[PDB]
Amino acid sequence: RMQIDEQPGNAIGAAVEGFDHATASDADIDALKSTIYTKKIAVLKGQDLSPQQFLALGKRLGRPEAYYEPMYQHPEVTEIFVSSNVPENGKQIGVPKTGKFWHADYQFMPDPFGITLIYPQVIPEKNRGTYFIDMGRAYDRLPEDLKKEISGTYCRHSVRKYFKIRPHDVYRPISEIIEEVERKTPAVVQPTTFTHPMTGETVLYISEGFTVGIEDQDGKPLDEELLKRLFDATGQLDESFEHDNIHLQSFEQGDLLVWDNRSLIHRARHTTTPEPTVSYRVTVHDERKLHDGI
Amino acid sequence: RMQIDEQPGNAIGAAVEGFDHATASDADIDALKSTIYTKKIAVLKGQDLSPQQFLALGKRLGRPEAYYEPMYQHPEVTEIFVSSNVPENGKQIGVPKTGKFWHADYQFMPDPFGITLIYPQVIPEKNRGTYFIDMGRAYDRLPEDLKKEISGTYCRHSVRKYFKIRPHDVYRPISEIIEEVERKTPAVVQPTTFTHPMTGETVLYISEGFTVGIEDQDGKPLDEELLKRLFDATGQLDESFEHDNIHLQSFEQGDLLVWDNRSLIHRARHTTTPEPTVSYRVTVHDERKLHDGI
Ligand SMILES: C[C@H](CC(=O)O)N[C@H](O)C(=O)O
Ligand SMILES: C[C@H](CC(=O)O)N[C@H](O)C(=O)O
Ligand SMILES: [Fe+2]
Ligand SMILES: [Fe+2]
């Protein structure tokens, strides 16, 4: 039966032993969620699930949403997003090498979900794991002059930099794809900071991957140097990943990571050698919107 | 033996009967070239050539250059550019539906060639042919206030709007392809008008497909409205193709079109129904650069 072992103090993370999604109680689920919101990353140990079972687990936490671009979808379970460089029967399943940039999931969408679940299937032996930054904690550690500068500002977020070419795009003019991206997923505006609706923390909601501009309360665009200074101060421009804000989360076979997609940004690791790597993802809406202004 | 029948007066075009590239004399070649430079489009009749023979024909006119992106190249004759929606043994040969925008060939490159050759292989029965505008004649017919406005200006030309996605681009982030385009083929600058080095005509060297900006002699960028007014006045924004400058060039099996790639812009026709369409192209440098300032 479910036992949660939280990292001590303000250290990030929690290990969850004995969890079985099909027989966990309501109270088990609420406590797991409480751990996600407070410790940001919960690592479920010893999970051996089929794709259908992984979805059922995610459904225990909230309402799953399928990724809007179908080439990412698992062929049997639409709601599973697949990152994979391992062909199955010669077919490309999902998309290779996803998320190799700092971001929060669906940050470029009007209605981001609160919880992301990763179930690694094939794990590389070398550059293994995912980097994370707690942007609530990163906000708190900002120089107080930077905190005042971004007071009352809004940021615009867009998928335009990392949108991946799809198979049916081959031979099409590049400008036609760029236009389609801007039509289907126009840039969305959020307050630069917001109150986490479960914990009350102030979250700095920006990422190098998706945040493309910042403006003041009157709508006046601000020099993008302000964004670059915020990326720099929070650790997102440190290509050595030694910055104090950066947490490297590793995992072993059977681990399943569940994390706070409001508070955290993350980034896949780049591998210097070609290794098989397959991960399944489910993304779920919980009982509140991203912040209570949505 | 070669007989050239020129359209009368200032009407565009010439029919060339009895031409065989392997036994044509030097004088035949010089006269064909003279017809290209003065009548802009020469239609060689009754040509039945293999890919190797088509290249040899082009070599009679000048130095062929292979297209810089290899996916366009014929699998046996590298110097042949292939536009095709007809698979050969299940393989895509060349690129489907090329050139569906106003342009001059290689206008986005530092050193454009003077002569383009098209050898249609599979010809649609419906929307057949290629549109052309003589930009020397289009310059002459400009309102004289527009002629003064563009005096001494330079234009920048770029492939960035119609660069076609390549097979190995699938699953790559769109921004990485955009960056590669700007690195390999940065925008090139030309005088807005130049003197045709064979005929002495003044050519207005712009196209809706490739011309992305205009600036004065001091390098000061000008409102892009000036380019839009030049496109409008020369017939490039008329989506009905009824404008006085536009010439529709049709062809039948065995026709081979050779044209003045300094003076002319052109545009493939859009088909409303899916029909097989295959064309081979060779592009050749003649005895002068695009203009004598290169
Ligand atoms: C662009 C990214 C996919 C990718 O990196 O290929 N989407 C995010 O994963 C998301 O859920 O917001
Ligand atoms: C972009 C275009 C190819 C295409 O339309 O796919 N290149 C031109 O044909 C040229 O030779 O300048
Ligand atoms: Fe992600
Ligand atoms: Fe062309």
Gap sites in chain A (C to N > 2.5 Å), preceding residue numbers: none
Cβ-nearest to B175 among A97, A161, A166? A161
CA distances from A210 to A101, A118, A194, A240 (A): 9, 20, 17, 21
Cα A89 off chain centre by: 29
- Position A232, amino acid: D
Tell whether ligand 1 has an atom less than 6 A from the beta carbon of residue A161.
Answer: no
CA distances from B263 to A136, B132, B163, B267, B290 (A): 62, 10, 23, 14, 10
Question: How many residues in total does chain A contain?
Answer: 294
Give the whole-angstrom CA distance, residue A139 versus residue A203.
6
| Cα–Cα nearest to A185, from A253, A126, A251, A109 | A109
Q: What residues of A are in the B interface, CB distance below 8 Å?
A: 92, 95-97, 160-167, 169-175, 177-178, 181
A188 Cα–ligand 1 center, Å:
15
Nearest residue (CA) to ligand 2, atom 6? B98
Pair of tokens at residue A205: 């909601």
Give the whole-angstrom CA distance, residue A114 versus residue A33.
11
Q: What is the DSSP letter of A7?
A: P
Q: A242, exposed or middle or buried, with CB in 10 Å at 0-12, 13-18, 19+?
A: exposed
Kindly list the residues from chain A whose CB atom is less than 8 angstroms away from the CB atom of residue B162: 173-175
Go through A253-265 and write b for each residue having 16 or more CB atoms within 10 A of its CB, e for each that does not.
eebbbbbbbbbbb
Strand B14-17, strand B3-6: pairing: antiparallel
Cβ–Cβ below 8 Å for B165 and A167: no
Cβ-nearest to A162 among B161, B167, B173? B173
CA distances from A107 to A217, A220, B3 (A): 20, 22, 68
B70 Cα–ligand 4 center, Å:
16
Kindly list the residues from chain A whose CB atom is less than 8 angstroms away from the CB atom of residue B174: 160-165, 174, 177-178, 181
B164 is in an annotated binding site: yes
Question: How many residues in total does chain B contain?
Answer: 294
| Pocket perturbation via mutation, ligand 1, pick of A79, A85, A98, A284 by most ligand atoms within 8 A of CB | A98
**What are B189's strand-pairing partners?**
B156
Give the whole-angstrom CA distance, residue B147 versus residue B144.
5
- Minimal C-alpha gap between A165 and chain B (Å): 5
Backbone angles phi, psi at B157, to 5 degrees: -125, 140
Strand B154-157, strand A256-260: pairing: unpaired
CA distances from B217 to A181, B151, B153, B187, B222 (A): 37, 9, 5, 17, 11
Q: A89, exposed or middle or buried, with CB in 10 Å at 0-12, 13-18, 19+?
A: exposed
| Cα–Cα nearest to B123, from B282, B18, B280, B261 | B280
Give the whole-angstrom CA distance, residue B116 versus residue B286.
11
Pair of tokens at residue A91: 């077919």
Give the whole-angstrom CA distance, residue B35 versus residue B16.
10
Give the whole-angstrom CA distance, residue A18 versus residue A21.
10
For A81, other C-beta atoms within 10 Å of its C-beta total: 26
Cβ–Cβ below 8 Å for A170 and B174: no
Tell whether ligand 2 has an atom less than 6 A from the beta carbon of residue B64.
Answer: no
Give the whole-angstrom CA distance, residue A153 versus residue A194.
11
- Residue A46 near residue A254, CB atoms below 8 Å: yes
Give the whole-angstrom CA distance, residue A51 versus residue A64.
13
Give the whole-angstrom CA distance, residue A29 versus residue A21.
9
Cβ–Cβ below 8 Å for B174 and A178: yes
| Cα–Cα nearest to B168, from B156, B176, B158 | B176
Give the whole-angstrom CA distance, residue B226 versus residue B214.
8
- Residue of chain B whose alpha carbon sits nearest to that of A181: B174
- Residue A92 near residue A115, CB atoms below 8 Å: no
**Which technique?**
X-ray
Q: Tell me how many domains chain A contains.
A: 1
End-to-end Cα distance, chain A: 37
- Minimal C-alpha gap between A180 and chain B (Å): 12
Show binding-site residues of A. 67, 72, 99, 103, 105-106, 164, 266, 270, 281
- Position B179, amino acid: E
CA distances from A213 to A157, A189, A263, B45, B161 (A): 7, 9, 20, 59, 24
- Minimal C-alpha gap between B69 and chain A (Å): 12
Strand B14-17, strand B41-44: pairing: parallel
Backbone angles phi, psi at B103, to 5 degrees: -165, 165
Sequence-ordered list of residues with C-beta below 8 angstroms from that of B119, at least 6 positions apart, any chain:
B47, B49, B54, B256, B257, B279, B280, B281, B282
Residue in the block written with tokens 């104090």 = A244
Sequence-ordered list of residues with C-beta below 8 angstroms from that of B225, at least 6 positions apart, any chain:
none
- Residue A254 near residue A45, CB atoms below 8 Å: yes
What stretch of H or E contains A145?
helix A144-149
Give the whole-angstrom CA distance, residue A237 versus residue A115.
25
Give the whole-angstrom CA distance, residue A134 versus residue A261.
10
- Residue B287 near residue B174, CB atoms below 8 Å: no
- Residue A206 near residue A192, CB atoms below 8 Å: yes
Residues B151, B156, B160: CA angle, nearest 5 degrees: 155
End-to-end Cα distance, chain B: 37
For A233, other C-beta atoms within 10 Å of its C-beta total: 17
- Position A8, amino acid: P
**Structure resolution, Å:** 2.2
DSSP SS3 for A30: helix
CA distances from A75 to A82, A99, A169, B121, B171 (A): 9, 20, 20, 40, 17
B105 is in an annotated binding site: yes
**What are B64's strand-pairing partners?**
B284
Sequence-ordered list of residues with C-beta below 8 angstroms from that of B212, at least 6 positions apart, any chain:
B156, B157, B158, B160, B161, B187
For B112, other C-beta atoms within 10 Å of its C-beta total: 24
Cβ-nearest to B172 among A160, A164, A171? A164
Cβ-nearest to A170 among B163, B167, B174? B167
- Minimal C-alpha gap between A75 and chain B (Å): 17
Give the whole-angstrom CA distance, residue A133 versus residue A144.
19
Give the whole-angstrom CA distance, residue B43 versus residue B130.
13
Q: What is the DSSP letter of A264?
A: E
Go through B194-227 and write b for each residue having 16 or more CB atoms within 10 A of its CB, e for each that does not.
bebbbbebebbbbbbbbbbbbbeeeeeebeeebb
Cα pseudo-dihedral B171, B176, B178, B181, rounded to 10: -110
Ligand showing the shortest atom-to-Cα distance for residue A209? 1
3-state secondary structure chain B: CCEEEECCCCCCCEEEECCCCCCCCHHHHHHHHHHHHHHCEEEECCCCCCHHHHHHHHHHHCEECCCCCHHHECCCCCCCEEEECCCECCECCCECCCCCCCECCCCCCCCCCCEEEEEEEECCCCCCCEEEEEHHHHHHCCCHHHHHHCCCCEEEECCCCCCECCHHHCCCEHHHHHHHHHHHCCCEEEECEEECCCCCCEEECCCCCCEEEEECCCCCECCCHHHHHHHHHHCCCCCCCCCCCEEEECCCCCCEEEEECCCEEEEECCCCCCCCCEEEEEEEECCCCCCCCC
Cβ–Cβ below 8 Å for B169 and A170: yes
Cα pseudo-dihedral B130, B135, B137, B140, rounded to 10: 150
Residues B125, B131, B136: CA angle, nearest 5 degrees: 160
- Minimal C-alpha gap between A133 and chain B (Å): 23
DSSP character string of A159-194: STTTPBPPGGGTTSBHHHHHHHHHHHS--EEEESEE
B104 Cα–ligand 4 center, Å:
6
Q: Which domain holds residue B160?
A: 1-294
Give the whole-angstrom CA distance, residue A214 versus residue A192.
8
Strand B154-157, strand B211-215: pairing: antiparallel
Give the whole-angstrom CA distance, residue B81 versus residue B280.
6
Cβ-nearest to A175 among B92, B95, B162? B162
Cα B105 off chain centre by: 4
3-state secondary structure B156-198: EECCCCCCECCHHHCCCEHHHHHHHHHHHCCCEEEECEEECCC
Go through A15-47 and write b for each residue having 16 or more CB atoms within 10 A of its CB, e for each that does not.
bbeebebeebeeebbeebbebbbebbbbbbbeb
Residue in the block written with tokens 């599973």 = A80
For A191, other C-beta atoms within 10 Å of its C-beta total: 16
Pair of tokens at residue B157: 């030309």
- Residue of chain B whose alpha carbon sits nearest to that of A97: B171
Pair of tokens at residue B106: 């290689």
What stretch of H or E contains A43?
strand A41-44
Give the whole-angstrom CA distance, residue A288 versus residue A194.
13
**What are A279's strand-pairing partners?**
A83, A120
Sequence-ordered list of residues with C-beta below 8 angstroms from that of B140, at least 6 positions apart, any chain:
B202
Gap sites in chain B (C to N > 2.5 Å), preceding residue numbers: none
Q: What is the DSSP letter of A134?
A: E
A286 Cα–ligand 3 center, Å:
17
Sequence-ordered list of residues with C-beta below 8 angstroms from that of A183, at least 6 positions apart, any chain:
none
| Cα–Cα nearest to B172, from B160, B162, B182, B180 | B180
For A144, other C-beta atoms within 10 Å of its C-beta total: 7
